[PDB]
């Protein structure tokens, strides 16, 4: 009786008070999940579970406690069982878009068997060639278009009412999301910090009576040249959802941002210089000065990368549905030509999701398409968790090549210890890198 | 005003009802810290923001758009400001403990430097060599029993009062805590699916009766063995807060978990023998046979691995607190003596957490320790956060060796359709012996009515 952590749900009325059909997560469950309830709190947050007991937030390294909370964990009195695994993502490495497809679709195991399967429990009809007696076998694989289509080879004769009229399946809009999370790198060669320039001088107090409450601030422009190089051709067509900045490797600091909505293959280097402002604030006693000092740095890495491209693509299945026993959700018997396309990734609307319609399974008003409930009675419900997790398993393209970047920044404004009791010549920062060094 | 993700609070008190002293976080405020306020809702969640919007679970692909819920995402009225960023990981290479902890210590930029700072700020006197006018240079590391001390060069004289008594930050008690989710692997050295066996045949509805009542089942018992190696010495004293399974790679579906509070360096291999069984429940019209196939697999898996250990660790700051500028709560006068821990990584207690202290500044009975918001007025709260930040940056090493596992299974069974003939019966041929000697041991196909 595992716990589904999707189904956890926080509500805030009191000592051990649930919501309605809910009730209060105890001192066990928590902890077989609870790396998942730890992420969905506050930092300082605590919050109660059965008996009095409590789980501390993420800052309080997520102990469970005994404890009050006014605010409860919990958990439906009557939680939706057989949730669909998520397998781990099948991983396939870089190359050119066609490429990419191409392994995925003539994949008998991981591809074409789930999907002619899922296909065949739904109750589309002769979803297998005429060569071979099982489903998802014997099946032709074209190219069509921008997409694929997979169905069985309807060569030669064949037995069975219509058998001549086989099911196809298409796979088509393919995208490719560029996961930054999955960043890898391999070994990294031009790896330096150098120290260039090291601006020193004094922050004089005369006035008899000690002195603090004061900024020594400074502000420049800071640097960074970057360049890289795409593998393949895949890249062209991959983008990320997000914009976010190019990852820190090794000490060389490095200000980059990676464009959302807009081509890898067309983002491959840039130079940006910011005005940063470093600060400190001394405490030079009476009649005194002190030793201050700013540093300035340039560093450069190069180092082949390897992002996560998850693909996505439509499921689109066409055939009849079997008479006495389709999961449709009107269960027709006239073997109508029947047409329905999944959204394979990313959710767009209830419609095309196999993980919406299979999650709100148990409730009338929402089917509207698919019976799932139909094919777990005619199927056994592992049965269908297995297909699903199949169909559904998050797939992987590598995307590869080479980086290589270069900046200049500053250190801290450091002030050292002072002593009984600062030049900035633009045209030499100027030429190090440095321009607009007004401190 | 950035809005701070760590200080969201969900309230479930009608609709765009907040509690005392929080607020309805805006579309506007939402969408800029979309991805975070998404990964703590649940899958099919849909929760309240201001103004007649809603966010949507990860199921719903986080999705902001018009509704109402009677939850709300909320967030203080008076916030907690300038919380300590939080940089990315400072990775050290795999290798013995004493060199991952001598990379560590003997870092300048990112551990000597940052820890004398902090030293500094909070009031300790004389972090620095005798060689050097600013704080943490000159700075002698030096190797104390199982832990380290960072000390200035106190090597011949020096001016000012008691400037001999230089402050020591000693580093002890590490501890590495291997994160599952870190997970990263090799080129795979080995990987397939093969099949070994096909068995094959039929099954038969002698009756004049369309049959569909009646299970086929196929149970069998199969081994699953795996090894790993561990290429350094730190692992011997690498552990994980919670068991875990060894992440899915291929298709060779693998039942491995890795038990909690045991070195890593101890679970190097180990064999399970798990009875399966699965069904079907054909219908099989009047006089007729399907067919049926099982395959059968052969999986085996080898690759370089390479996980990443939290590292955490001790800093006890012992030296004198400056005259008029320290940061004790107090703030003593006559420079005593201190001695203080802080416990760089998870949290034990508020009195060794930098993190609680600095988030708990503004609430005057929480100071009971440093005075954070004095070392603010004195230093300027950047220049406190990018010190904190660089102090509780996060420090991990790497795991490494190599993994290979082995595995045998059956596939579905697979019925085709109705062949009529020229309360099921089987002919399914069976070799017990060749089965075992393949791996599959007790292997048998059952017909019987299910509920």
Redesign the interface.
């Known amino acids: 009786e595992p716990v589904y ?9 009191g000592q051990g008070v649930c ?1 309605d059909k809910y009730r209060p997560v105890n001192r066990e469950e928590a ?1 077989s999940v ?2 998942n309830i730890v ?7 605590i919050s109660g579970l059965a008996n009095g007991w409590v789980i501390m ?5 997520g102990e469970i406690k005994p404890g009050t909370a006014s605010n409860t964990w919990c958990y439906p009195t009557n939680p939706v069982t057989g949730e669909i695994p998520t ?2 993502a099948l991983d396939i490495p870089d190359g050119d878009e066609v490429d990419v497809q191409w392994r995925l679709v003539h994949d008998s ?2 591809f074409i068997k789930p999907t002619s399967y899922l296909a065949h429990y739904l109750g589309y009809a002769w979803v297998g060639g005429n060569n071979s ?3 998802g076998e014997d099946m032709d694989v074209t190219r069509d278009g921008d997409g694929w289509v997979i169905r069985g080879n309807n060569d030669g004769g064949c ?2 009412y219509r058998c001549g009229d086989k099911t196809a399946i298409k796979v088509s809009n393919f995208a490719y999301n560029l996961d930054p999370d999955s960043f ?1 790198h391999g070994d990294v060669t031009q790896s330096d910090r150098q120290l260039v320039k090291t601006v020193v001088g004094w922050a004089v107090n005369d006035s008899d009576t ?1 002195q ?2 004061y ?1 020594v601030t400074l502000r420049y422009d800071t640097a960074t040249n970057w360049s890289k190089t795409n593998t393949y051709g895949l890249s062209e067509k991959v983008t990320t959802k ?1 914009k976010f900045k190019w ?2 490797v090794g ?1 060389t600091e490095l200000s980059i941002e990676i464009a959302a909505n807009q081509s890898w293959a067309s983002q491959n280097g840039g130079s940006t210089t910011t005005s940063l402002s470093q ?3 001394p ?1 030079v006693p009476a009649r005194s000065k002190i ?1 201050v ?1 700013i540093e300035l740095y340039k560093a450069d890495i190069s180092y082949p990368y390897e992002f996560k491209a998850d693909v996505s693509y439509d499921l689109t299945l066409s055939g009849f549905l079997r008479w006495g ?1 389709n999961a449709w959700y009107t269960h027709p018997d006239n073997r109508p030509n029947w047409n329905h396309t999944f959204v394979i990734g ?3 609307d209830k419609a095309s999701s196999i ?2 319609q299979w ?2 399974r148990y409730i009338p008003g929402e089917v509207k398409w698919w019976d799932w409930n139909w094919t777990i009675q ?3 419900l ?2 269908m968790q ?1 297909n699903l997790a199949r169909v559904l398993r998050p797939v992987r393209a590598g995307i590869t090549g080479d980086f290589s970047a270069e900046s200049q920044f500053a250190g ?1 404004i ?4 002072p002593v009984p009791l600062i030049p900035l010549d633009a045209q030499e920062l100027s030429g190090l890198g440095f321009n607009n060094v007004s401190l």
């Open positions: 952590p999707d189904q956890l749900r926080l509500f805030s009325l919501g902890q609870k790396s992420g969905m709190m506050g930092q300082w947050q937030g993420p800052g309080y390294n397998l781990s195991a991981n007696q099982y489903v037995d069975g890898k000690p603090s409450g900024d997000n990852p820190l000490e600060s400190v604030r405490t030793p000092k026993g990313p959710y767009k993980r919406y999650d709100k005619q199927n056994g592992s049965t297995n801290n450091e002030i050292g210890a």
